[PDB]
Amino acid sequence: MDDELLAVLGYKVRSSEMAEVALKLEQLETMMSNVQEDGLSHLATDTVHYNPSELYSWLDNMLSELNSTRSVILVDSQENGVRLVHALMACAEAIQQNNLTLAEALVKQIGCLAVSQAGAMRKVATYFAEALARRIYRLSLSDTLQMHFYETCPYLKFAHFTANQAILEAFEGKKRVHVIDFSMNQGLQWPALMQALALREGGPPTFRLTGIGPPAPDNSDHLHEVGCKLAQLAEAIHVEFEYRGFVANSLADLDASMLELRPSDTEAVAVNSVFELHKLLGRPGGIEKVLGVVKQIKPVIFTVVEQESNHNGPVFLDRFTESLHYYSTLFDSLEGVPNSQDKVMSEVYLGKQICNLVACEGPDRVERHETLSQWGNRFGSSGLAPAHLGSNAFKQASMLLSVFNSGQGYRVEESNGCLMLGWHTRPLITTSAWKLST
Amino acid sequence: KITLKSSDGENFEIDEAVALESQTIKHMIPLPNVTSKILSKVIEYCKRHVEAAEGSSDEDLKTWDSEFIKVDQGTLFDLILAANYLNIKGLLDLTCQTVADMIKGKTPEEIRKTFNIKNDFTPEEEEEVRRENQWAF
Amino acid sequence: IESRTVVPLNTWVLISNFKVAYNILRRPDGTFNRHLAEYLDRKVTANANPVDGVFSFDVLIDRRINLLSRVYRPAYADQEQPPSILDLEKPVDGDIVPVILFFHGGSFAHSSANSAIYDTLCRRLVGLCKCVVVSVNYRRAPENPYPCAYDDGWIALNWVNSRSWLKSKKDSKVHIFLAGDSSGGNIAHNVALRAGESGIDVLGNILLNPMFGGNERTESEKSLDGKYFVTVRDRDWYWKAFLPEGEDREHPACNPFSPRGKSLEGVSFPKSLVVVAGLDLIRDWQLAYAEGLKKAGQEVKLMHLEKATVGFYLLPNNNHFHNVMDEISAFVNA
Amino acid sequence: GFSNLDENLVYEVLKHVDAKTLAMSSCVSKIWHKTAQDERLWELICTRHWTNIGCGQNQLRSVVLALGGFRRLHSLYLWPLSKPNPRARFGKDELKLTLSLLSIRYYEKMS
Numbered sequence A: 001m002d003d004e005l006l007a008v009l010g011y012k013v014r015s016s017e018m019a020e021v022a023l024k025l026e027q028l029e030t031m032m033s034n035v036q037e038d039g040l041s042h043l044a045t046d047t048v049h050y051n052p053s054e055l056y057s058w059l060d061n062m063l064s065e066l067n068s069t070r071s072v073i074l075v076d077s078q079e080n081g082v083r084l085v086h087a088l089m090a091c092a093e094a095i096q097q098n099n100l101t102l103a104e105a106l107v108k109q110i111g112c113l114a115v116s117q118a119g120a121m122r123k124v125a126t127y128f129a130e131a132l133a134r135r136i137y138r139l140s141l142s143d144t145l146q147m148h149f150y151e152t153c154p155y156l157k158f159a160h161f162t163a164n165q166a167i168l169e170a171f172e173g174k175k176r177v178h179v180i181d182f183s184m185n186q187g188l189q190w191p192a193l194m195q196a197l198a199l200r201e202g203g204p205p206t207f208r209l210t211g212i213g214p215p216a217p218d219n220s221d222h223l224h225e226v227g228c229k230l231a232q233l234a235e236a237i238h239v240e241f242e243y244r245g246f247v248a249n250s251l252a253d254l255d256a257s258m259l260e261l262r263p264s265d266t267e268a269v270a271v272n273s274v275f276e277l278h279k280l281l282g283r284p285g286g287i288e289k290v291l292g293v294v295k296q297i298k299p300v301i302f303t304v305v306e307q308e309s310n311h312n313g314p315v316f317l318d319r320f321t322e323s324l325h326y327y328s329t330l331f332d333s334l335e336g337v338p339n340s341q342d343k344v345m346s347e348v349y350l351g352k353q354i355c356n357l358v359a360c361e362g363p364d365r366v367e368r369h370e371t372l373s374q375w376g377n378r379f380g381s382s383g384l385a386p387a388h389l390g391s392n393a394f395k396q397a398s399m400l401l402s403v404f405n406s407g408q409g410y411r412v413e414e415s416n417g418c419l420m421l422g423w424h425t426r427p428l429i430t431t432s433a434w435k436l437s438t
Numbered sequence B: 001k002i003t004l005k006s007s008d009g010e011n012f013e014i015d016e017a018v019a020l021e022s023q024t025i026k027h028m029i030p031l032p033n034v035t036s037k038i039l040s041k042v043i044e045y046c047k048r049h050v051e052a053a054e055g056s057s058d059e060d061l062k063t064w065d066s067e068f069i070k071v072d073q074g075t076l077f078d079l080i081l082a083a084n085y086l087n088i089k090g091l092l093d094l095t096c097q098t099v100a101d102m103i104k105g106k107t108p109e110e111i112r113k114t115f116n117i118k119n120d121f122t123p124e125e126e127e128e129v130r131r132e133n134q135w136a137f
Numbered sequence C: 001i002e003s004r005t006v007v008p009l010n011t012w013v014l015i016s017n018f019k020v021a022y023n024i025l026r027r028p029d030g031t032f033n034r035h036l037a038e039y040l041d042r043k044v045t046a047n048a049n050p051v052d053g054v055f056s057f058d059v060l061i062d063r064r065i066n067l068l069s070r071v072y073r074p075a076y077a078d079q080e081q082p083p084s085i086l087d088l089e090k091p092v093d094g095d096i097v098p099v100i101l102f103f104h105g106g107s108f109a110h111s112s113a114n115s116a117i118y119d120t121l122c123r124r125l126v127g128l129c130k131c132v133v134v135s136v137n138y139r140r141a142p143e144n145p146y147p148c149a150y151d152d153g154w155i156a157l158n159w160v161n162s163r164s165w166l167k168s169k170k171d172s173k174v175h176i177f178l179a180g181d182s183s184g185g186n187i188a189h190n191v192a193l194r195a196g197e198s199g200i201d202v203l204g205n206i207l208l209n210p211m212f213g214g215n216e217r218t219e220s221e222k223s224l225d226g227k228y229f230v231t232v233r234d235r236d237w238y239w240k241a242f243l244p245e246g247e248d249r250e251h252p253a254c255n256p257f258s259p260r261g262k263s264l265e266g267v268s269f270p271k272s273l274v275v276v277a278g279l280d281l282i283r284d285w286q287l288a289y290a291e292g293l294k295k296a297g298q299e300v301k302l303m304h305l306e307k308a309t310v311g312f313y314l315l316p317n318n319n320h321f322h323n324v325m326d327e328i329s330a331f332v333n334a
Numbered sequence D: 001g002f003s004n005l006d007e008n009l010v011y012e013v014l015k016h017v018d019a020k021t022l023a024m025s026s027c028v029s030k031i032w033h034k035t036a037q038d039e040r041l042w043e044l045i046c047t048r049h050w051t052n053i054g055c056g057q058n059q060l061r062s063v064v065l066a067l068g069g070f071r072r073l074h075s076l077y078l079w080p081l082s083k084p085n086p087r088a089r090f091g092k093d094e095l096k097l098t099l100s101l102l103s104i105r106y107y108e109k110m111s
Ligand SMILES: C=C1C[C@]23C[C@@]1(O)CC[C@H]2[C@@]12C=C[C@H](O)[C@@](C)(C(=O)O1)[C@H]2[C@@H]3C(=O)O
Pocket: C015, C016, C018, C019, C022, C105, C106, C107, C111, C182, C229, C230, C231, C234, C310, C311, C312
């Protein structure tokens, strides 16, 4: 059992390990008294630190080297925002009360308020009313859209670089590697990983890639097209390459037999998935079948990037309330971004997300977001122990938020061996890595 | 003991080990290119560096270089020519550091005016070269 | 060997861990390892669900400088369901309501309002004093040396004084108590000076081990040097990082009673509650500050604890914490 | 008569400047422009403030020239990183970030 007075302060120290931790602190104090400035500089710049909360392990590393929560942020607004939120909360309860007569007037009422309103609240009100408008009537481009989300918002670049570091660290010491991308999309994560293996000390391995994509008449060959361009890059840096595309309606339609896996000792396997597992919660039993296949693959790492929110509640106005706060923060972050066609197409990308969130039901609704606490419960029951992220990944994400984003207030924080990207103090997304429990 | 004869024809005498500092001379003396004044300057430089070869002395030699480098534009041009011709690493490096310090100057008008360099950029190319290096401006 | 018998083991572990981490994070040429400092910092997030009678929410006070504050309020006893977004800025019911404006310590370089040690302190202040707290997130040194914190405090105070939902029904006014810890005490003193200069009427001032110094070496610095978690070397490092270029430790931001400073005679100042630790490396400076308050014609209640080190208020396992909290509650509800 | 310097002499002179000075002189004239694009000068500039990376200069030079070169590596990402910390020396993670950005840009512009 931990020390409650210290666990409140953010440190997981056993009550029976106090003496050992104090003794190691004494030993560390003496060592830094002896080794002095050069040793301290070594400890600062040549070390990667993992899980600062566990004091025992952090001190051991230093010694061995020297030898439901509702987070809300209120931005400046006007009372018309309160009137808008009052109108928005009026229609959601009226449409939930089976009124369907006051809702038509209330939906019209929201429209008249939005025009007077100015700022980011006008955009959120317009998109929520439209999804509220044609929810009433239900009881009575894509490739360029995800592209426009890359050069405007920092969530995709954060997801790629932070997951690459976890995969890169687990691949050291291996001669043949194989990565499976559940979110292949257009292969924007992998060009950066291939170069890092080229400059790896000891020699690059044989890199094999296998992508899985949603069905389409063109996406069957679009995945083939993607591997055509990645094969051209793997030869300019002298890396052995291999590729194989997939077409599948849902990740639940997969099995380990058709992935064509060599023995894991011969080829190391790393599974990747970015913004994909939340689309699987609409199908009953989907998430349990996929997580039973990843265990069948027996990889060395499985990196998951998701959205930090609770948008999968069993009560409609509960989902409506949380989603309105979360998408209010997102539209507040984009308020200062200079106006561009990438920015315009980014809101349409998110507008389609709002609209599917409240208007649809059953398998048609795919935006079943969950928090890391809920996500960690699913992975833990499968048998996936956490793999902690270090300060090297933290540093790159912090400098990433400094090249493209300058004045916007994005921050990175560490929690439970994970990394979070948020606006000021409000978390938005989380990156976690997992390994089979032994 | 070796005699080098320059464009002036005067047989400047210098010690063999001192003359060995020039790789071209060591490998092979009409010397039709190097003028008498520049040959004298290279002889002085080689003599001083041989005395140094045969810190407080390091900084004294450095300030002596600083004093010797104080020469006009044509003299620096000829020194670069002679250093490249006679394959002397130290003299070429010193004159190069001097000109590099000189070109650590202002906007391109200043560089093109002090060196009398005449640019003929076609305005598409002038503007494009200005934009492609906009980070510096 | 000497600090082990004066504090409990958990407090010793916490302070020693902080000291060794800050030792690692300090570089001799005057630069700070910001990325590793932020990676090692333990933080929390705001929660609108009342836990133990307290709930919190963040407010973006300023966007140009990214100035933020966290508001702690007692749970609405009249209602049963948890508060909504509109219920957050609900007017207070009560004849008199005091609001505490808190500044956190860290020697102008460490910690934040989101830290797990100052969030706990603010929640305990709300629970014990029966008030509302506003915790400011000011800029830090050496990236933002001076006077960035003294401007963040002024902006936060100007914001707090304007909240129509924080007014009291007795006189249609807001009753503000400035509170500071460590360097927060320094910020509190300077912000109280600025508020007294202007029309804002601060009623009280609370200082917990305020950070003041000087050129000369007092007897506590010589006698107590490295004995209890603090050395003069890192004190001088932090003063060098915070202060402007080409200035000594006699700058008024370091010593308020320097000849270059300003006189506190004929000056309206709030009543002060100064808590001075005994086993502190800079105890003499704090006692001199209290004496300079007493001899300037102002009011001050000095609380000198003989066997108190730094950070006694971060854990509720000592008598000093209980005595100080009782005195703060009596000072506030007066 | 520095106005009619040949390529080798211009390169010799320009080995002793920094990024600002080289990118400044690159707008002097056409021959200065041609000599300023040289890969060796920009490799020297990029490696000048690194002082800590190691994998072998051959591998790094080959990879960086395959993906766009050192001039792009400096202009696009290295200079913005050096803008707020002019005195700081880039270590290991800065190279990892910058080369990853170069790889991404090469893949995007490939089609
Ligand atoms: C370098 C420092 C900073 C200390 C004193 C110390 O010498 C070592 C311990 C630091 C500290 C740790 C956490 C708190 O933020 C602090 C105010 C405290 O009480 O103790 C911190 C305190 C301080 O801010 O003065």
